[PDB]
Amino acid sequence: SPVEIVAGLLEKEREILSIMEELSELLENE
Amino acid sequence: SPVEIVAGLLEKEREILSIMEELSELLENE
Amino acid sequence: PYKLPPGWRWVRLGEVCLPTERRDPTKNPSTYFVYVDISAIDSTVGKIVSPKEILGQHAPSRARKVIRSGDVIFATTRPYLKNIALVPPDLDGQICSTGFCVIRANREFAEPEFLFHLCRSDFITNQLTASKMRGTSYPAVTDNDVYNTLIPLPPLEEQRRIVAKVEALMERVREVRRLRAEAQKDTELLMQTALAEVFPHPGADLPPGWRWVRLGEVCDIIMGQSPPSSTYNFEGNGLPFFQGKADFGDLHPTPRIWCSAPQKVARPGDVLISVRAPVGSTNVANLACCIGRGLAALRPRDSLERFWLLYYLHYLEPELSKMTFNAITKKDLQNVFIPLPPLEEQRRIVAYLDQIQQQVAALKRAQAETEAELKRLEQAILDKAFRGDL
Amino acid sequence: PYKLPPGWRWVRLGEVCLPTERRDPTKNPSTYFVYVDISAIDSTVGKIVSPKEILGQHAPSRARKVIRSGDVIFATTRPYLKNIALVPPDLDGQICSTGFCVIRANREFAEPEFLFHLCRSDFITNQLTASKMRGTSYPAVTDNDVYNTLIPLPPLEEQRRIVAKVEALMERVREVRRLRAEAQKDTELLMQTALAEVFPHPGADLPPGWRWVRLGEVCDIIMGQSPPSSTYNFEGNGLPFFQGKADFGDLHPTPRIWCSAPQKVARPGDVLISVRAPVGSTNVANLACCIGRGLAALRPRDSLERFWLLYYLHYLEPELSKMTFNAITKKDLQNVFIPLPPLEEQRRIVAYLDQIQQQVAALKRAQAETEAELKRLEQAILDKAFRGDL
Amino acid sequence: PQTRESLANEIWRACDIMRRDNNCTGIMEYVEHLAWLLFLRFLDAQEEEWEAQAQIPIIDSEYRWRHWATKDWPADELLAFVHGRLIPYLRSLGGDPLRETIRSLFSERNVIVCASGYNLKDVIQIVNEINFHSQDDIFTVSQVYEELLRRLGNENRLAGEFYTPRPVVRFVVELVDPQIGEAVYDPACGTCGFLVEAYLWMKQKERTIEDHRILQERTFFGQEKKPVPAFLGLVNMMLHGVTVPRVMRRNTLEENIRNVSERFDVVVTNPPFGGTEGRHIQQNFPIQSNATELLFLQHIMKKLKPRDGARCGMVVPEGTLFRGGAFAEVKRDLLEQFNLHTVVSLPPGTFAPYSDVKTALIFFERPGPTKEIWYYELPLPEGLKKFSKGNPIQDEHFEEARKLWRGWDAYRKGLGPVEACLSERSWIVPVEEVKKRGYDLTARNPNRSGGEELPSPVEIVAGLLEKEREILSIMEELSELLENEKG
Amino acid sequence: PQTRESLANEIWRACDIMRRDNNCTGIMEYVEHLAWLLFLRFLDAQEEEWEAQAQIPIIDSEYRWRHWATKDWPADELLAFVHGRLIPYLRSLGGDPLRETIRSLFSERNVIVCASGYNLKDVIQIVNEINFHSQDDIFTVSQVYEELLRRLGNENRLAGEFYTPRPVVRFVVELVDPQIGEAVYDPACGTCGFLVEAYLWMKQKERTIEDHRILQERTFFGQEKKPVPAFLGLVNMMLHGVTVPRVMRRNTLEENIRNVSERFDVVVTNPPFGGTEGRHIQQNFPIQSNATELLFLQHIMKKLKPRDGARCGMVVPEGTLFRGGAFAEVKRDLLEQFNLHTVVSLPPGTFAPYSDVKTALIFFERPGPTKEIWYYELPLPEGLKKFSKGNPIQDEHFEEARKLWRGWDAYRKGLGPVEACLSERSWIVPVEEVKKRGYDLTARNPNRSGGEELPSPVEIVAGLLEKEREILSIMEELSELLENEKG
DNA sequence: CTGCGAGGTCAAGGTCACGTGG
DNA sequence: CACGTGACCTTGACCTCGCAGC
Ligand SMILES: C[S@@+](CC[C@H](N)C(=O)[O-])C[C@H]1O[C@@H](n2cnc3c(N)ncnc32)[C@H](O)[C@@H]1O
Numbered sequence A, B: 001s002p003v004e005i006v007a008g009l010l011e012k013e014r015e016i017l018s019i020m021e022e023l024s025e026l027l028e029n030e
Numbered sequence C, D: 001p002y003k004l005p006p007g008w009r010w011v012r013l014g015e016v017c018l019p020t021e022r023r024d025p026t027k028n029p030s031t032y033f034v035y036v037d038i039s040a041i042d043s044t045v046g047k048i049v050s051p052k053e054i055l056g057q058h059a060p061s062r063a064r065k066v067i068r069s070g071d072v073i074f075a076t077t078r079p080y081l082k083n084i085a086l087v088p089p090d091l092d093g094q095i096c097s098t099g100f101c102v103i104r105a106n107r108e109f110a111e112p113e114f115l116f117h118l119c120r121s122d123f124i125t126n127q128l129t130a131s132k133m134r135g136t137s138y139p140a141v142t143d144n145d146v147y148n149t150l151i152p153l154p155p156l157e158e159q160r161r162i163v164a165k166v167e168a169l170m171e172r173v174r175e176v177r178r179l180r181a182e183a184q185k186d187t188e189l190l191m192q193t194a195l196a197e198v199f200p201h202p203g204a205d206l207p208p209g210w211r212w213v214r215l216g217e218v219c220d221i222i223m224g225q226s227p228p229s230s231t232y233n234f235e236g237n238g239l240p241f242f243q244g245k246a247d248f249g250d251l252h253p254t255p256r257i258w259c260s261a262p263q264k265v266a267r268p269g270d271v272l273i274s275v276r277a278p279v280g281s282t283n284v285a286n287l288a289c290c291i292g293r294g295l296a297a298l299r300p301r302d303s304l305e306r307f308w309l310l311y312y313l314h315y316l317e318p319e320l321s322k323m324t325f326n327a328i329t330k331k332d333l334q335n336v337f338i339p340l341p342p343l344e345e346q347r348r349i350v351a352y353l354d355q356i357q358q359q360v361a362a363l364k365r366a367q368a369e370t371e372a373e374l375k376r377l378e379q380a381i382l383d384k385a386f387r388g389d390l
Numbered sequence E, F: 001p002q003t004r005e006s007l008a009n010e011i012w013r014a015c016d017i018m019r020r021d022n023n024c025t026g027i028m029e030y031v032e033h034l035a036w037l038l039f040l041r042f043l044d045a046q047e048e049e050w051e052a053q054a055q056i057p058i059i060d061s062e063y064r065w066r067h068w069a070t071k072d073w074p075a076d077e078l079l080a081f082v083h084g085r086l087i088p089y090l091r092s093l094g095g096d097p098l099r100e101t102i103r104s105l106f107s108e109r110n111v112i113v114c115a116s117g118y119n120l121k122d123v124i125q126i127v128n129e130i131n132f133h134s135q136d137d138i139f140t141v142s143q144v145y146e147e148l149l150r151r152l153g154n155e156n157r158l159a160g161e162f163y164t165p166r167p168v169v170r171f172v173v174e175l176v177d178p179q180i181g182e183a184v185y186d187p188a189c190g191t192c193g194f195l196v197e198a199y200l201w202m203k204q205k206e207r208t209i210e211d212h213r214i215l216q217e218r219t220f221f222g223q224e225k226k227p228v229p230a231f232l233g234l235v236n237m238m239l240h241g242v243t244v245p246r247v248m249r250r251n252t253l254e255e256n257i258r259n260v261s262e263r264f265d266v267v268v269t270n271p272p273f274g275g276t277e278g279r280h281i282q283q284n285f286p287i288q289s290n291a292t293e294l295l296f297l298q299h300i301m302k303k304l305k306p307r308d309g310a311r312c313g314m315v316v317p318e319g320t321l322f323r324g325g326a327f328a329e330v331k332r333d334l335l336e337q338f339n340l341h342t343v344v345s346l347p348p349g350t351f352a353p354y355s356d357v358k359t360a361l362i363f364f365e366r367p368g369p370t371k372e373i374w375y376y377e378l379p380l381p382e383g384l385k386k387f388s389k390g391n392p393i394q395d396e397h398f399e400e401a402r403k404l405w406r407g408w409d410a411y412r413k414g415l416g417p418v419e420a421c422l423s424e425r426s427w428i429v430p431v432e433e434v435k436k437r438g439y440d441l442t443a444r445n446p447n448r449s450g451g452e453e454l455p456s457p458v459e460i461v462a463g464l465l466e467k468e469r470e471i472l473s474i475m476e477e478l479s480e481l482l483e484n485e486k487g
Numbered sequence G: 001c002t003g004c005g006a007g008g009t010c011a012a013g014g015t016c017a018c019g020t021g022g
Numbered sequence H: 001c002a003c004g005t006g007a008c009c010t011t012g013a014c015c016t017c018g019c020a021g022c
């Protein structure tokens, strides 16, 4: 499943990224 | 022995009295 | 709280103290130590008179507290009994019962004997009554109350060497009471010595006109018995009831209870003697009354003066009281032997002994009052001492 | 300690607290209770996840503290492990191990959740390191230090409401690391998946030119043995010595010790495989060295690429590792089966797998660093929070 | 009644007339002068009632108040009459015992008469302008008389010895709660005595014909030793008043206690703090001590009737409370024979200027033996160290004492909570502990500075001295008598 | 030596001549202008020595410093000569030896030359009035140059990048304690480098003839990438100075660490403070990361000789200390490969104006594995929030650091008590605890205020974002590559 | 093999209650 | 009887050993 895995991994990554720009969003404020 | 005893008793009494006029003696002062 | 002289400061007992150690002697099982417990203290003089030396192995659970020279040990169990003591150099660094509060005076602020004499006074113990229990039924207090009760601290602090004055005073004072005690003991035998002169021991020859006689001959006896308990009443029905010596006053018995149906009655002028322990006590009877089993009533016959018999019985009292358990019998009383002078001479000697007795009574009461006021004098010494009035 | 915003006050933690009860459940022997101990807390999220309900009769000696809704329980035994929890309503009024320090916030001053997040922070526990001992050797502290350690408390008493704001941040934050963990887990499987394609399962037939071959055929093996201990030296005499996997680096083994009289030597480019638990780990030899019995050295004949064999062994590693105690033998290694493509194709696939591996390594390290800085981000959240900076 | 204004003023005028006069030095002389005039007028009125009962001869007609007071004298002839033919005539009374009384009252020295015959005539006319057939006018004069007695109480340090503060009286009477008819006894009634207050109370309940007679005749028995308080008091009890009350000039210690006879339902009293009596009198008591107060205590103890509910309110000094010896014995007896249900510590100077001695109110009951004792310390105003001529004791302090005592009275009979009677100034002491203390009944307030305000040592050692050489005298007597009566 | 005298003062004069000039904007331009003149004079002197052993021509003869500097030029003709003929002649020598080297050093941008030919002539003659055969004068010029470099360090934020505070240097060199002869290496030597301090020190122990020639020939190996610090530094090491020092314009990261074969006893260094380099360079290292500082750390780790007592003093930022991932790995290796015996936390602004980043001095040793680490936090004066251009770091703060470190050095080999090296400012951290912290070597003071002066959270989330987008780039690269190489 | 924590022992007080001498 | 001493109980603190993880 090598190729499939990277995909899902990639989705997970840009999801995480989404979460942390929500983090930056709500952290200023400042 | 009745008579002797009052005697001796009397001696203890004048002794006690002496002690307590020395007590008053040193109590003023005050 | 108080008003105090310029030098004096009020500080909690604790503030003046050093922290104090406690150690376990069983950690040194073969090392002996001297143990001090509340029983080892003489309450009167506030000293440790009877320590006990114990092997560290056999050490009681209580023995955890270490004492040192100048320490004041203040018992926390009933501290109105004045078990308080100043620790001698001989007892330095040593263990006692945890029921003690250890007071280590730090000599910067307090010298120990002053604190001893403070604790010895009703002052601190009354602070303890103000706090804790007032009336609340428990005999003991924690160490930290005894660390929180207010006290005056007397700096300039060789001003607390006014302790010297106190001790000077006190010893002379205590000495007085010693002598007073001796006087009191001795004064009592005066009466008996007087009696010893008037009544000859048995089998001796007697002055002319006197004769030995059995009491039963010159006296008749009503033994007395206790009625059923229904008869007893406080509503004053029938006659007063006296079961035994407990009902006696020192001359006449005080009636507190009545018997609606009396069995054996004692008229006025009968002489009452206790027939059960304590045997031999006597009171005259001043009113018609009913007598219990604990009492026997002696009615003196014509040849006899009730006071002649009475004084005789006072004379005989010490081993007229023997000590299976002791009771005395009608026959026992009838066969006791009494000297019988003529009635007139009896009344004469009765008069003489009467004024002797009133004199020694007046005497008794006087020295008793002096003693009481010596206690009060002591309390006055301490109260006056702890404010600047010497 | 530091600056304060206008409202906030510095208060000792204890000053904000309520007195707290302790009771003995054996006094109610047939009454069940819920018990909470340090093992019942999840260190990561600071919750009580596993209480145990016990009959009051079977209550442990430590079971004596009553928790209540909003109480913060802070373990005093090693409180750097962050066993701290906020007591839910379900656990109100209940016993938990004495190991804990019970914090009952009086709502007049402090909201409990704020105190939870304060304790959850490295703040208070660093207070605990600063006092007590710095680096002395005892794991635990008394409850009353945890009552004396300074905290900043902010009034109102909305801000404690602010923390309510912190929860938002944290939730998102924890969620991130959740994903990161999963990512990391899965990311490593990539390598094996890639390998899964290149190496066929045994007994399948292979693309043309390839052939199955016994390792012994294309590889020759030097088993290795451990010398006497006199040979060992730090003065760099003879050759470096590697006993087992413990000496392995991530690619090449770091020599820390030498053997003055080597017995079995591994020349560079030999491939080293561990032969005892953990068995099957591989590392390559970058320098001439001596090998212990814990290692076997594989040296590849032509027709075999050291990296082809290496990647193969990496593929085989999970059940190349068996689990009586684990050891592998020369015959065992010689009779393992390996796919053998032409040498050039081997080096081609080796190149390809090499760049896959460099990419996933870079990847690994990257997300590892993100994880670490997420921890740091958390600590930054709390440090910034307990000052007026949000 | 109380037609104070027209009449009261005059009496006050008469007082200022005596102030002007030389031989009336002070308020003392005012009140006794007024007393003897008022008494003569009283005697005349009573005899007139007895003319009415004669229908169905205390003094010669010439010497009745009527004939000599009504006539308008030249002043000198009046003065000459009073000193020359009147007073000696009144010492001229030999007859039935009562006249012996009249003679008795005058016979003791030196009746107060104005130096100016004019002033004397004026005072006499003010007295003669009182209507004795109006109970209104009598009420007024009684009030003025009472105020005069109070002022006399404040100004004069010797009285003092025959006076007691009315707040103390009213309080004691209130706590004792006399009913009709139980006799009321003051074995030493200085002047008036508590008897007037007891009268007024028991009277506030009469409300029937039978009762009044009981009040006027059979309910007041008490006695006085010294002539001046005896007289002033007689005048006061007739003034308030009971028509002809029974109280005797006599010694209370005259009487033997074993004989007792007597006795009474109630004793409300303030016996003397008192000093020595000694000798013959001592033999009248089972316990014999020179101290007057102790003998008075014994007398009171046996003066009470045997019935349950036999009460005594009484005033005692520190001495009777803390002293041991015979006192303890008597005190022991009290506690065993009697139930002493309360003690009120009374601050120093309550009796000033007479004493400043700390005193206590002792209310002891006689159902039975004494178990628990209620102690109430009483507050001074915190401005004052002690009560004074300037600031005397008044009814209010006792008002608080009153409310707390109501609490204790409720608890004693178990009709109320203990919490009612307790306050930091109130505490309850169990009898065991007073017996451990050698019968020291002195007030020790737990919830108070430990200081017990004891007198300085020197005074203690002084009294101790005098009674120590008293002991020596006793022993001297003992050995004199023991070799005297040798055969 | 010294004799700054007239000579120092002049040089200062030249500086104000350049201050007046248009083409010298700031102290930067002063120091580089002075540098290129001084360097040419130096080259001429060295060759002249080589005439002396030629007896047993880099450029000539028109272009040697002798002929053109001695001449009295019309200003315009001088300026025209330098720009028109000389710089170009230098730009193109082409001799495979150095001579290429020389161009490399005239290779780029602006050679700083005065706008006024008059000023240029003045500065040139001030420079040629220096006697290079008197090392008193060389010493003087070295001192003035050093001060110029310090002032340059304060004024210009761009250096900054190639400068390090001399107190830091002297401290690091003092603690490392170089001896003769161990090679001394700075894998990035900004300008001068620690090499001058190392020189002067090792010189203070010089002792013998054989030694001096070791110092000037065989003991200084270090290197620099960027032209301006390379040049300024070259001038500085010949100034202090070493006759012909070995340092190369090159990249240390172009080198492949795994082949190593160059090693040194000592490394005293301050590598860059950290940005990306990437790609092809990355492959030179076993651990691969874009971060320059990490690669420099690796390079240093393998640049050390295998013998025991192999030392490195080094300057690192917060980042290298608290960052995980590859850093941790390298740090792990460090701690096991090496004994890291001290860390000195250096407060923010130490390097201002270049950066205020908090830094740490890392002295790590290489007998063996790392057991315990000595931490010394360093105090700011209580007046300042941070060190500044206005108030910079100076040798004193380090006086205290020095004394305590002497203590720690004593304890480490067990020649002294631990108590010597401890102050609330100094504490000792066990290696175990840094491994539970995920290899966070940041200073945490046990006996100190809680606040750890951590960045505002957002900055954290900002960096977190940028390297997350790096992660995305990496993954699409991954899928590009596995979809590319599909058969 | 090492760090964690729950069971255990231990010390400091504090309250309870039984033996016993006056 | 009521006074103390031995005992039991509680709180709070330190010891360390069975146990599961690197
Ligand atoms: C203090 S007073 C009583 C006060 C009185 N209750 C009142 O209302 O003022 C004592 C009085 O008792 C009188 N007294 C003293 N000795 C006495 C005695 N042996 N018999 C009778 N009365 C006596 C005194 O004259 C004095 O007036």
Ligand SMILES: C[S@@+](CC[C@H](N)C(=O)[O-])C[C@H]1O[C@@H](n2cnc3c(N)ncnc32)[C@H](O)[C@@H]1O
Pocket (backbone or CB within 6 Å): F161, F162, F163, F164, F165, F186, F187, F188, F189, F190, F191, F192, F193, F194, F223, F224, F225, F226, F229, F250, F251, F252, F253, F269, F270, F271, F272, F273
């Ligand atoms: C902080 S400085 C070194 C300071 C120097 N030790 C001093 O204080 O004298 C960093 C220097 O390293 C140089 N440098 C940066 N990257 C480099 C590389 N890859 N190779 C060599 N030198 C480099 C930079 O030009 C900069 O001058």
